[PDB]
Amino acid sequence: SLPCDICKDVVTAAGDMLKDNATEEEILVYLEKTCDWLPKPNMSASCKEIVDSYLPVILDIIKGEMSRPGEVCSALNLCE
Ligand SMILES: CCCCCCCCCCCC[N+](C)(C)[O-]
Ligand SMILES: CCCCCCCCCCCC[N+](C)(C)[O-]
Ligand SMILES: CCCCCCCCCCCC[N+](C)(C)[O-]
Ligand SMILES: CCCCCCCCCCCC[N+](C)(C)[O-]
Ligand SMILES: CCCCCCCCCCCC[N+](C)(C)[O-]
Ligand SMILES: CCCCCCCCCCCC[N+](C)(C)[O-]
Ligand SMILES: CCCCCCCCCCCC[N+](C)(C)[O-]
Ligand SMILES: CCCCCCCCCCCC[N+](C)(C)[O-]
Ligand SMILES: CCCCCCCCCCCC[N+](C)(C)[O-]
Ligand SMILES: CCCCCCCCCCCC[N+](C)(C)[O-]
Ligand SMILES: CCCCCCCCCCCC[N+](C)(C)[O-]
Ligand SMILES: CCCCCCCCCCCC[N+](C)(C)[O-]
Ligand SMILES: CCCCCCCCCCCC[N+](C)(C)[O-]
Ligand SMILES: CCCCCCCCCCCC[N+](C)(C)[O-]
Ligand SMILES: CCCCCCCCCCCC[N+](C)(C)[O-]
Ligand SMILES: CCCCCCCCCCCC[N+](C)(C)[O-]
Ligand SMILES: CCCCCCCCCCCC[N+](C)(C)[O-]
Ligand SMILES: CCCCCCCCCCCC[N+](C)(C)[O-]
Ligand SMILES: CCCCCCCCCCCC[N+](C)(C)[O-]
Ligand SMILES: CCCCCCCCCCCC[N+](C)(C)[O-]
Ligand SMILES: CCCCCCCCCCCC[N+](C)(C)[O-]
Ligand SMILES: CCCCCCCCCCCC[N+](C)(C)[O-]
Ligand SMILES: CCCCCCCCCCCC[N+](C)(C)[O-]
Ligand SMILES: CCCCCCCCCCCC[N+](C)(C)[O-]
Ligand SMILES: CCCCCCCCCCCC[N+](C)(C)[O-]
Ligand SMILES: CCCCCCCCCCCC[N+](C)(C)[O-]
Ligand SMILES: CCCCCCCCCCCC[N+](C)(C)[O-]
Ligand SMILES: CCCCCCCCCCCC[N+](C)(C)[O-]
């Protein structure tokens, strides 16, 4: 179906963007800068340690999901 082909191309494009070797680094810097809203030195440092540890964990989950564009698109009722 057209909505299915479109949905699967969009999820593919998302997955390719996330596979890009500079994407995770860009996100990491952005989230570490956010931690700088916290007092220093200790709270901001603890926040950066949680980001550094968990961002690649969360990224991996998303990328895994984008690797199955049919499944994603079925969950949205766009592929059947
Ligand atoms: C995850 C990206 C989704 C892009 C696919 C676009 C959704 C197609 C819209 C289908 C529903 C339109 N409607 C209401 C007339 O059925
Ligand atoms: C009337 C405009 C012609 C095409 C309109 C529908 C195209 C939806 C955009 C597809 C998404 C592009 N993509 C997959 C590279 O991200
Ligand atoms: C119902 C309209 C279908 C459009 C689905 C949404 C497409 C995601 C847009 C990403 C931008 C990609 N691009 C090349 C079209 O710019
Ligand atoms: C489920 C689809 C959610 C993604 C929506 C975001 C679309 C990003 C494309 C932005 C492009 C806009 N513009 C004017 C710069 O072309
Ligand atoms: C579950 C997927 C929803 C994410 C929708 C956002 C589309 C990201 C694709 C961006 C591709 C870059 N591009 C073609 C606009 O230059
Ligand atoms: C949401 C799943 C992961 C993909 C996130 C999609 C949003 C990014 C689309 C913005 C396009 C990026 N760019 C190069 C124009 O800055
Ligand atoms: C379902 C998760 C997708 C949500 C993230 C989509 C956000 C796309 C934002 C791109 C904005 C592009 N620009 C240059 C016009 O700002
Ligand atoms: C769903 C997890 C968060 C997705 C947010 C990713 C947005 C990245 C901004 C565009 C940068 C990607 N790239 C390839 C141009 O470097
Ligand atoms: C997995 C958590 C995702 C939410 C984080 C949003 C990512 C923002 C990355 C955009 C980087 C901004 N910029 C333009 C300086 O590249
Ligand atoms: C738990 C998911 C991550 C939530 C991320 C919230 C970040 C939004 C705050 C904007 C940060 C902007 N800046 C320029 C300081 O990097
Ligand atoms: C650990 C992943 C989440 C990254 C975002 C960090 C949250 C700190 C933002 C709270 C802002 C602090 N304050 C006092 C300026 O509001
Ligand atoms: C899980 C926590 C994610 C939320 C992080 C966003 C914090 C928003 C507070 C922004 C306030 C920053 N400032 C400098 C304007 O005070
Ligand atoms: C876990 C979901 C929470 C993610 C959303 C948190 C974003 C907070 C952004 C507030 C930014 C405030 N300000 C004015 C500095 O931009
Ligand atoms: C050393 C600074 C003293 C308190 C620092 C920790 C407070 C965290 C901020 C709580 C969130 C505020 N709230 C719940 C209204 O959003
Ligand atoms: C580990 C540090 C604990 C901070 C948790 C994040 C608090 C969310 C910030 C929302 C902004 C609320 N307020 C009043 C503090 O600005
Ligand atoms: C949903 C908002 C969450 C705000 C709560 C802040 C998280 C507290 C950090 C506990 C973990 C610190 N650590 C790694 C030293 O255990
Ligand atoms: C302001 C820093 C809090 C980051 C927001 C994301 C939710 C907090 C999760 C912290 C997890 C800590 N731990 C080790 C108990 O998993
Ligand atoms: C920027 C990402 C923010 C950190 C997200 C923290 C996730 C902690 C999940 C703890 C769940 C432990 N579990 C699954 C055994 O219950
Ligand atoms: C929009 C991002 C949603 C990510 C949802 C995935 C759940 C996080 C998995 C928990 C982390 C695993 N663990 C137990 C090692 O902490
Ligand atoms: C703030 C990013 C979202 C991550 C939070 C996800 C909650 C993880 C704890 C429940 C996971 C249970 N289980 C068995 C599916 O791993
Ligand atoms: C593209 C923006 C975020 C959407 C992708 C997030 C994946 C959702 C995965 C939740 C269930 C996955 N799991 C743990 C059962 O494998
Ligand atoms: C759970 C999905 C997280 C939402 C992702 C937010 C993407 C913000 C797009 C910022 C990139 C736009 N630009 C051109 C300034 O880089
Ligand atoms: C905006 C995109 C919507 C994301 C929808 C995520 C669908 C999750 C499918 C759950 C299937 C579980 N598993 C482990 C087989 O992937
Ligand atoms: C784009 C926003 C995220 C909404 C996508 C959630 C997927 C819904 C389809 C699976 C739901 C299954 N169930 C039984 C829990 O309803
Ligand atoms: C933008 C947030 C989208 C996240 C929604 C995730 C949908 C998961 C569908 C429920 C199915 C449960 N499970 C474990 C089979 O994945
Ligand atoms: C701004 C919100 C975007 C629309 C989100 C669309 C969610 C559709 C979920 C369909 C799932 C139907 N279901 C659960 C029976 O499979
Ligand atoms: C970050 C937002 C995550 C929302 C996840 C909740 C799943 C969406 C529920 C599906 C909508 C129900 N239904 C079948 C009436 O479409
Ligand atoms: C560009 C419009 C698409 C919105 C992005 C959110 C996912 C599409 C879900 C459309 C759901 C349509 N329907 C009626 C089949 O549920």
From Swiss-Prot:
Glycosylation positions in this chain: N21, N42
Coiled coil location: none
Disulfide bonds: C4-C79, C7-C73, C35-C47
Saposin B-type domain: residues covered: 1-80
Protein name: Saposin-A
Source species: Homo sapiens (Human)
Origin organism lineage: Eukaryota, Metazoa, Chordata, Craniata, Vertebrata
Residue span relative to the full protein: 60 to 139 of 524
